[PDB]
Amino acid sequence: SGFRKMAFPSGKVEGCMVQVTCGTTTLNGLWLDDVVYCPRHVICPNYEDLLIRKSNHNFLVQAGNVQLRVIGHSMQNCVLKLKVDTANPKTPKYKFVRIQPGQTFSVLACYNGSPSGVYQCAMRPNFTIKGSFLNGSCGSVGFNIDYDCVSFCYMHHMELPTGVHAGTDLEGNFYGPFVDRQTAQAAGTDTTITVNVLAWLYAAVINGDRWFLNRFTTTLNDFNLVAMKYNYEPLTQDHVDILGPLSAQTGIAVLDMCASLKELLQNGMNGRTILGSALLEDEFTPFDVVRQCSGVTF
Amino acid sequence: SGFRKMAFPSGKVEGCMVQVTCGTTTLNGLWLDDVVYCPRHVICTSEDMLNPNYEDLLIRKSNHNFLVQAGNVQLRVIGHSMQNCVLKLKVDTANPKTPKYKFVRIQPGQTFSVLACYNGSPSGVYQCAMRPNFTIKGSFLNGSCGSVGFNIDYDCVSFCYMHHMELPTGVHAGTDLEGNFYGPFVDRQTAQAAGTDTTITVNVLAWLYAAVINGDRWFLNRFTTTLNDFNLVAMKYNYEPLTQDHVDILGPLSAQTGIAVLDMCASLKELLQNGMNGRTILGSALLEDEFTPFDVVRQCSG
Ligand SMILES: CC(=O)N1Cc2ccc(Cl)cc2[C@H](C(=O)Nc2cncc3ccccc23)C1
Numbered sequence: 022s023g024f025r026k027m028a029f030p031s032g033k034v035e036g037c038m039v040q041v042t043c044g045t046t047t048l049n050g051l052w053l054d055d056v057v058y059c060p061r062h063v064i065c066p067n068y069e070d071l072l073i074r075k076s077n078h079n080f081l082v083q084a085g086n087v088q089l090r091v092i093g094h095s096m097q098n099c100v101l102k103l104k105v106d107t108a109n110p111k112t113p114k115y116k117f118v119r120i121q122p123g124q125t126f127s128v129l130a131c132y133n134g135s136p137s138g139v140y141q142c143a144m145r146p147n148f149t150i151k152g153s154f155l156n157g158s159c160g161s162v163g164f165n166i167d168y169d170c171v172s173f174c175y176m177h178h179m180e181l182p183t184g185v186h187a188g189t190d191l192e193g194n195f196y197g198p199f200v201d202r203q204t205a206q207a208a209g210t211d212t213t214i215t216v217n218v219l220a221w222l223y224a225a226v227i228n229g230d231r232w233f234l235n236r237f238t239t240t241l242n243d244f245n246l247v248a249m250k251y252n253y254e255p256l257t258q259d260h261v262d263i264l265g266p267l268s269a270q271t272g273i274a275v276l277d278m279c280a281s282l283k284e285l286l287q288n289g290m291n292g293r294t295i296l297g298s299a300l301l302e303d304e305f306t307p308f309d310v311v312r313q314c315s316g317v318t319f
Numbered sequence: 320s321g322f323r324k325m326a327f328p329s330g331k332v333e334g335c336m337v338q339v340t341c342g343t344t345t346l347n348g349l350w351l352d353d354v355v356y357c358p359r360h361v362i363c364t365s366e367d368m369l370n371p372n373y374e375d376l377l378i379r380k381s382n383h384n385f386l387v388q389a390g391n392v393q394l395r396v397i398g399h400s401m402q403n404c405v406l407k408l409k410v411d412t413a414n415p416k417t418p419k420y421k422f423v424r425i426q427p428g429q430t431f432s433v434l435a436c437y438n439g440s441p442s443g444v445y446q447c448a449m450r451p452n453f454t455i456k457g458s459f460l461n462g463s464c465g466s467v468g469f470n471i472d473y474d475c476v477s478f479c480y481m482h483h484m485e486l487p488t489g490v491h492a493g494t495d496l497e498g499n500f501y502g503p504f505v506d507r508q509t510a511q512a513a514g515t516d517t518t519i520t521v522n523v524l525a526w527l528y529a530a531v532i533n534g535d536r537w538f539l540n541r542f543t544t545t546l547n548d549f550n551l552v553a554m555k556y557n558y559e560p561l562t563q564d565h566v567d568i569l570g571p572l573s574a575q576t577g578i579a580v581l582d583m584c585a586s587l588k589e590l591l592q593n594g595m596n597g598r599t600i601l602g603s604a605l606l607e608d609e610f611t612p613f614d615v616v617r618q619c620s621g
Pocket residue numbers: 062154155156157158159178179180181186200201202203204320
């Protein structure tokens with residue numbers, strides 16, 4: 022029993038965190054094989070013009086108390102790829118994956134190439150992450166651990182005026198309509214990840230919380246009309262199919278749980294809580310619920 | 320900016336997780352140097368659990384009865400001893416991944432990270448607080464026994480909890496790394512119940528200071544309170560009494576924000592009375608109590 026916002030074990034990622042210094046700028050790098058990946062704003066804009074003026078010895082890379090010598094440098098979108106002489110012995114089995122909004126991942130927050138914390142995050146529908154980052158956190162990575170392979174999905178670049186965070190996949194492609202420079206940028210209007218709220222309602226049912234259940238069901242269209250009114254993401258047939266295992270395990274049809282969410286959206290919690298929360302939680306995917314309520318290890 | 324329930328990087332702890340098997344029972348062990356620490360109930364059957372004489376059960380065991388597995392490598396148990404409710408399995412290999420570590424016993428309200436494991440394999444990390452009733456609100460399934468709670472301060476891992484059992488209310492009970500239980504619990508299947516829980520007041524105030532540091536000031540008021548009047552109100556909402564130690568501990572946050580601890584107490588009294596009125600504090604509709612004053616300073620400064 023119990024339901025916590027759980028992150029993947031960070032160990033495999035910790036062995037990849039390095040410090041990247043270029044001029045006065047210090048941020049984090051991800052060292053995989055003989056390449057160090059970091060936000061290209063470390064050189065700061067005409068990034069091709071700024072990069073051509075740099076030599077390899079301008080980038081000081083530090084792995085623990087050991088300096089790595091940079092032998093090459095190239096830019097891929099908004100990421101700088103610093104070729105180094107030493108291949109990281111702690112390099113795990115890894116993939117670079119771009120995630121979709123609503124998908125969750127763990128963030129290993131670092132300062133000066135040193136991991137300080139791990140937390141669970143969701144890619145908001147507005148392509149921002151509600152993270153916890155201070156200055157120096159740039160280059161901190163987001164990941165999922167699939168069996169023994171680390172899927173790198175996020176590299177932190179900046180903080181938006183509302184305190185939310187923006188970053189790229191490991192190929193330098195930003196999540197959202199953001200750019201890596203000091204200009205007027207704002208996070209768009211956010212929405213609730215519906216499939217994730219339903220998944221968390223199934224996790225509450227598995228944990229004995231059933232007060233919100235009702236005898237009612239709904240059509241997917243009737244629910245999507247209600248969801249749109251509360252700034253909830255449209256629920257697709259794919260989401261309904263994805264919730265299938267949880268629906269079979271609890272005996273509550275996805276549209277039956279949708280009718281519960283409909284009543285929670287119109288009537289509220291009425292002083293009650295679900296899994297210790299007075300708000301409907303949307304940062305647990307259906308897979309996160311199955312992994313935590315069945316016990317998958319890495 | 321931002322405030323998250325943040326756990327410590329688990330890597331140092333992951334390199335210590337092993338699987339301990341005794342007959343049919345399988346649980347996790349913490350391998351530090353040449354010793355594997357695990358709950359002593361690994362020697363028990365499900366029947367024995369009501370009234371087990373652990374000294375009697377342990378004297379009947381030999382070293383080769385304990386199968387210890389570190390990854391895909393079986394470790395050879397060369398000795399065994401019991402220290403309170405922990406079994407210390409001396410092994411023939413010192414863990415090369417052994418970090419700088421300390422065994423620390425924590426007080427209620429203190430927080431720590433939990434690396435939940437099954438079969439010596441880490442599956443997740445989350446943040447926890449030792450409840451005032453000496454239980455932890457964890458996320459644990461069968462086979463999680465032996466999972467550890469820790470803090471990482473600088474480069475040293477402070478081991479503070481080892482998971483032993485789940486109480487009937489879904490909450491968890493365990494020991495420090497010396498085998499001493501937190502709370503009036505025993506490693507037995509006897510009728511045990513978690514006492515009435517209370518909110519860790521110093522932690523709620525710390526989280527209100529974190530909200531102030533992050534620009535949330537809606538809940539502040541023009542009032543102050545005496546410490547005694549705050550506790551008289553706090554007790555009515557099942558909040559832990561706030562001591563002068565707590566007031567002193569909140570000093571740095573009070574200085575940083577400019578809001579006296581007893582003024583922050585007056586805000587809390589008002590939030591208890593009024594509720595949130597559809598508003599949130601740090602993305603939460605409830606008053607959060609699993610962030611200590613130390614956690615807030617570390618997350619809001621470095
Ligand atoms: C002065 C400032 O805030 N910056 C401007 C900026 C613009 C564009 C890009 Cl790509 C990066 C950045 C950096 C930036 O967002 N850095 C930071 C990242 N994550 C959290 C932070 C929390 C407090 C401060 C900085 C943080 C630096």
